[PDB]
Amino acid sequence: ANIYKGKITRIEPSLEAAFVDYGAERHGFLPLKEIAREYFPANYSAHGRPNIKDVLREGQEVIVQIDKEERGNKGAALTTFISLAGS
Amino acid sequence: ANIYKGKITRIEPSLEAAFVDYGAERHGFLPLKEIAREYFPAPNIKDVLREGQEVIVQIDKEERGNKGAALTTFISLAGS
Ligand SMILES: [Pb+2]
Ligand SMILES: [Pb+2]
Numbered sequence: 001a002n003i004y005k006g007k008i009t010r011i012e013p014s015l016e017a018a019f020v021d022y023g024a025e026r027h028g029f030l031p032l033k034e035i036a037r038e039y040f041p042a043n044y045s046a047h048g049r050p051n052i053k054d055v056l057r058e059g060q061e062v063i064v065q066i067d068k069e070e071r072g073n074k075g076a077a078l079t080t081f082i083s084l085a086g087s
Numbered sequence: 088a089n090i091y092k093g094k095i096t097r098i099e100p101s102l103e104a105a106f107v108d109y110g111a112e113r114h115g116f117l118p119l120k121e122i123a124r125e126y127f128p129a130p131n132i133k134d135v136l137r138e139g140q141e142v143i144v145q146i147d148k149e150e151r152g153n154k155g156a157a158l159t160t161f162i163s164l165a166g167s
Contacts, residue, residue, distance in 0.1 A: 001091070001092065001110060002092075003090055003091065003092050003143065004090065005089070005090050005162075005164065007165065008166075023088070039167070057166055057167075059165060059166050060164070060165060060166035060167050061164040061165040061166060061167065062164065062167075063090065063143060063162060063164070082092075082143060084092070084140075084141040084142070084143070085094070085139060085140055085141040086137065086139065086140035086141060087140075087141070
């Protein structure tokens with residue numbers, strides 16, 4: 001089973017990424033490129049990327065799956081692009 | 088603690104609903120009204136879903152009596 005509701009805990013604009021509590025002791029890491037457009041509050045330009053602080057808010061929940069398992073001191077690499085048979 | 092990837096096991100036109108194996112022994116019940124438009128075809132349940140396809144669901148009512156959980160694809164997400 002590889003799906004979770006992740007709560008955004010700390011947003012890092014200079015990394016274009018956020019930390020996510022997905023129910024494990026150690027928070028995962030969610031890069032902007034792994035955030036599906038349904039989470040974006042507005043339609044951006046075809047060029048460039050928004051500030052992640054204009055995409056996500058602390059306390060918001062997103063649906064995530066683990067892309068890279070937790071390893072050593074690193075949190076899991078997460079994505080909101082969910083694998084579904086027949087989608 | 089309340090989100091699952093479910094596989095459609097059976098489609099029942101007479102109930103306008105599908106049954107979903109989301110990891111419990113009792114299949115969950117997913118009526119057409121609880122299916123988001125992201126699952127709809129490019130209408131009746133038979134046109135929308137097919138056996139083997141996966142959906143993201145949450146439980147809206149737990150198992151009770153002899154019934155599976157009542158499921159939805161309209162996932163509850165804080166802040167959004
Ligand atoms: Pb990716
Ligand atoms: Pb252009």
